[PDB]
Design a protein around this ligand. Structure first.
Ligand SMILES: [Ba+2]
Ligand SMILES: [Ba+2]
Ligand SMILES: [Ba+2]
Ligand SMILES: [Ba+2]
Ligand SMILES: [Ba+2]
Ligand SMILES: [Ba+2]
Ligand SMILES: [Ba+2]
Ligand SMILES: [Ba+2]
Ligand SMILES: [Ba+2]
Ligand SMILES: [Ba+2]
Ligand SMILES: [Ba+2]
Ligand SMILES: [Ba+2]
Ligand SMILES: [Ba+2]
Ligand SMILES: [Ba+2]
Ligand SMILES: [Ba+2]
Ligand SMILES: [Ca+2]
Ligand SMILES: [Ca+2]
Ligand SMILES: [Ca+2]
Ligand SMILES: [Ca+2]
Ligand code: NA
Lengths: 627, 627
């Protein structure tokens, strides 16, 4: 029915999904797009996850020519791949990819699909990846790059994050410029200051080297080491450097952060501005579908049925009656009952806030199940799982403390840990059964507990079909399933905002984190591509010592990934950068690390700082509002 | 006159000085307190600055017993002092101190002064310092501590900062507790994870050592080094540590910052709340002094004289007339003209914002000077000093570039640099003469340029009475006097907020910076007191190597000061902490460094972060308001 479809569009305004279609032809397109929305979700999340993982599992590129093949010399650690094996997965993921990327046409138009910049770029990368798999099939430099690109444009959350970044990138570049001025001036004045003195051994290459060292001091990664010769010369040399790390770290780095922060909050305000614009598009489509007379208002006899299927289909407001109309005219004192378009949306959002509790969506009998449903809905069940997890925790600390006491009662406790895993798979089956699959998926705690339970059960099939270190490690870890006991702390009035901010930050920071992860992966294929060596023997043991202890990496794609994590945490990065400089030979190999530090450290991480702060402030405001 | 005194109190409401006196007896007390306010300002800023500097120049304490006396063994660098010389300065500064600390009585009451907690603690430290100087005179553990304490309670700005810190300290302790929970849990799970594997060489002392290492990893100061054995064992060990530095650094450290931020803005809102309360106390004292009939309003014939001495004494509103009263009654259309107490303050603050331009406050003739005054007030003079500083800059880059080209035209340029110093002392004398001393002191640019000029002239007397490296260093540095050319950049619409935020941050961050500096000094007398050694020879060269290259310090009070700066910048701090641990011998010597890191790193520096951000946001808001 029209009114039914309208109520549906209203709960999609409240729940907030986004589609842009404008009709009996819009019904076939609606069936098509919803088809796409359900199955392609899991069967394609899997697909692009695995396809992106084909890049850290791919066969390296310097191993194709000389010399010795597959060794511990230049130190890798992951399984790699062959060409024959690589082609079959490149083809499979490329195929499911293709069918997805051309699917939208079925609910869009032909010239519409082919006029959308999104789909056009998606198919351009589709054909770059396809011609690649054809060449990697007959027998490579920009194959993984379309994997990470095609990944980042396959999840709307990372899409919109990248747009936000684009918006802040300009003013960000401005502050980067003023920053560059600071570094240049400080390098010139530092260098002209230590011109005819001992720190000619650290300002040897003069302004060229002193800008290098003043940059690495700007990141504080060499604070005591870099000016130790000058401190040895004079005591009062320090005055300079403490002046410079003072101004540069507490006066400069901070308001760079402030710049990225303000730019961020502005692009976010923009993003939710357009977001509310889309929700308005949907609710307005709806009321446009109830106002049959184009006058822009809806009747009593027309909104009693609309609120009727709202209260019947989505949420639990009240019941209509004869005092429904008598409360209508009694409330108005006028015999009109007409709601305009801009007040209807207000009604769907008042309903969206107060009345709204999205209800539960079999060829079976409730006969044998209606006891377990109503007794699992009892809070007694919640105290049951709570107490069960408590005793569980004591069990785990005893068993593990018996592998660290090395006594052998650890296995008698271990079997009980397995039977505890059984307890939890019971809780999962009875909970998913007694609430329904979608109502089970609606809460993040139950999503996580679900997938952790399923990792427990694949763990169980594996651990019992395969035959300790095969078991204790694969099962103690899921004590993270007791982590939900931390929600207890929110009952304390001191830590509510802390635990709450964190809890809501574990999802909301995930697109920004996945973004900086993809920047990592791109930089990783770059570094693998251009740093395949290790002059292995001499340039290595002369390059670094303890820093080659740290620098046995960057020659696999995983080694590159975790070395990029080390650069991410900033500690001792100039040994990776410095040693790869005196590995290649010229200075134009430092722009990898300066460019890295500047894209990820001054932009992305200042971004995540800003977002965490904004999340916690939001939290404090909500707690203020509840009272 | 009463009305005159009132207008005075109004401009002190606008300018915002603070006194709390409540009368012909309040006039003698007013003369007294103003006496104190002028001379004690310079002659006492000097005093407590020097007295505080008696602590880094004091004779050390482990040098009093054995063994070898005053050597390079255990490495100091500053002049020290003797007892005979120390006593005379302890006594002098203690004496001017005393006369100040008992001065307030003259404008306060006896039981009032002695009932104020401020003055009572001030005199308690007065007598602790005096009994000290008596003992240091006849022949020590808590002498410098009352120097830094007596310093921090001698400047209201640092006083109020410390109160703000007190206010945020509670909730700060709460987040510190939840943090401690994170570290403990992560240490237990990390340790039970690496229990029967190679990283028994890093989790040797078990939970005790693993909490140590997980703490130092929490500060990221050992990211690649600390888990390199486990990474050598398995590749998938990294997953743990990247998980942990992820959660701990981007999820935990950040919302700790957020906590200190919100607590800060709250205590600041409190502080300016009470501040406005004091300004209200002054303006209300004023209007209380004009409303002679206690009815709470002021007449026309009474506020025409009040606005009259406002416009005549402080600022430049308009002129009274017969159309002053005709504009009064013409504006009101009622023959009343009465202003209440709460609207009078509004009038003094509307005057304070729009009309307000505090005017210029000789037994001489303007005859010969009125040409230089009006031609220096011309902007042509501003373009004169601007161009002069530009050509000056080119001169300095040429001369200095000739000490780095080592050609000997550097001295011919150098004399011209001196004559440039002469140019600027001319600008200073003619500017201070043509604007007046107080109008010269009213702008921070002219305060700074004044004291830098005077350092140039003491430099000139010195450099010409003493006889290169005696000159080039002592004069090139004052090219910072051209630093004001950076104000030019504020004419660009991209960098206005940046340069402006910075410019206003060079003062506003100064009390928080001085605060963290005093925390440094206290920690410094602590460390000197308890770390006088260097088991010098063995425990040193076995303790540290490159880290003893860094650790030739902490055995003088300056060495302690700059080593505390190194700890402040956080880089490689665990070598100071670790080596001083295996110097003393037990683990109870790490609480110096954990306690340090926690008081200054998680509290004070998060504070200065928050304040910088708030300053820049304020700036953006003002630029928004001007349009
Ligand atoms: Ba020289
Ligand atoms: Ba030279
Ligand atoms: Ba070196
Ligand atoms: Ba109409
Ligand atoms: Ba619930
Ligand atoms: Ba609640
Ligand atoms: Ba080292
Ligand atoms: Ba074991
Ligand atoms: Ba063991
Ligand atoms: Ba070690
Ligand atoms: Ba930081
Ligand atoms: Ba009255
Ligand atoms: Ba001016
Ligand atoms: Ba202006
Ligand atoms: Ba850092
Ligand atoms: Ca390929
Ligand atoms: Ca209608
Ligand atoms: Ca003494
Ligand atoms: Ca009156
Ligand atoms: Na470091």
């Amino acid at each position: 029915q029209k009114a039914a479809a309208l109520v549906d569009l209203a709960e999609d305004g409240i729940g907030l999904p986004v589609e842009i279609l404008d009709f009996g032809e819009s019904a076939r397109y609606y069936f098509i797009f919803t088809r796409l929305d359900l199955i392609w979700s899991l069967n394609y999340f899997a697909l692009l996850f695995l396809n992106f993982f084909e890049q850290p599992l791919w066969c390296e590129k310097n191993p194709k020519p000389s010399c010795k093949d597959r060794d511990y010399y230049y130190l890798g650690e992951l399984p790699y791949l062959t060409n024959a094996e690589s082609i079959i997965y490149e083809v499979i993921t490329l195929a499911i990819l293709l069918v997805h990327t051309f699917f939208p046409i079925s609910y869009e138009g032909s010239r519409i699909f082919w006029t959308s910049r999104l789909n056009l770029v998606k198919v351009a990368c589709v054909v770059i990846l396809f011609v690649d798999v054809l060449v990697d099939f007959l027998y490579f430099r920009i194959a993984p790059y379309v994997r990470v690109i095609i990944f980042i444009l396959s999840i709307r959350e990372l899409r919109d994050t990248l747009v936000l970044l684009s918006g802040m990138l300009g003013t960000y570049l401005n502050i980067l410029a003023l920053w560059m001025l600071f570094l240049l001036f400080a390098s010139w004045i530092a260098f002209v200051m230590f011109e005819d003195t001992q720190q000619g051994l650290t300002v040897f290459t003069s302004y060229g080297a002193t800008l290098y060292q003043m940059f690495i001091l700007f990141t504080t990664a060499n604070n005591p080491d870099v000016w130790i010769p000058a401190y040895k010369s004079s005591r009062w040399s320090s005055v300079f450097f403490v002046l410079y790390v003072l101004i540069g770290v507490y006066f400069v780095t901070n308001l760079i952060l402030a710049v990225v922060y303000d730019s961020f909050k502005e692009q976010l305000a923009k993003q939710v501005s357009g977001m509310d614009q889309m929700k308005r598009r949907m609710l307005e489509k709806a009321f446009g579908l109830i106002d049959s007379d184009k006058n822009g208002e809806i009747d009593k006899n027309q909104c009693i049925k609309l609120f009727e299927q709202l209260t019947n289909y989505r949420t639990l407001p009240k019941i209509s009656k004869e005092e429904f109309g008598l409360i209508f005219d009694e409330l108005d004192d006028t015999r009109d009952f007409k709601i305009n378009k801009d007040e209807f949306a207000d009604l769907c959002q008042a309903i969206a806030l107060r009345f709204q509790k999205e209800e539960v969506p079999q060829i079976y009998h409730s006969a044998l199940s209606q006891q377990l449903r109503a007794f699992v809905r009892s809070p007694n069940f919640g105290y049951a799982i709570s107490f069960i997890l408590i005793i569980n925790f004591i069990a785990v600390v005893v068993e593990t403390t018996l592998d660290i006491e090395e006594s052998s009662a650890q296995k008698p406790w271990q079997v009980a840990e397995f039977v505890f895993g059984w307890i939890y798979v019971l809780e999962m089956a009875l909970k998913i059964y007694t609430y329904g699959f979608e109502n089970y998926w609606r809460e993040g705690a139950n999503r996580f507990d679900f997938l952790v339970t399923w990792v427990i059960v694949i763990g169980e099939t594996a651990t019992f079909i395969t035959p300790f270190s095969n078991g204790e490690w694969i099962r103690y870890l899921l004590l993270a399933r007791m982590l939900r006991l931390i929600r207890l702390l929110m009952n304390v009035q001191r830590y509510r905002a802390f635990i709450a901010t964190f809890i809501t930050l574990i999802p909301s920071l995930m697109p920004y984190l996945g973004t900086i992860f993809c920047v990592l992966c791109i930089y990783c294929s770059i570094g693998v591509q251009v740093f395949g060596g290790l002059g292995n023997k001499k340039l290595f043991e002369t390059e670094l010592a303890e820093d080659d202890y740290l620098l046995f990496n960057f020659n696999d794609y995983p080694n590159g990934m975790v070395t990029l994590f080390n650069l991410l945490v900033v500690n001792n990065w100039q040994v990776w950068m410095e040693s790869y400089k005196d590995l290649t030979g010229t200075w134009w190999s430092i722009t990898y690390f300066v460019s890295f530090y500047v894209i990820t450290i001054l932009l992305l991480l200042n971004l995540v700082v800003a977002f965490v702060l904004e999340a916690f402030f939001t939290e404090l405001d909500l707690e203020e509002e509840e009272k």
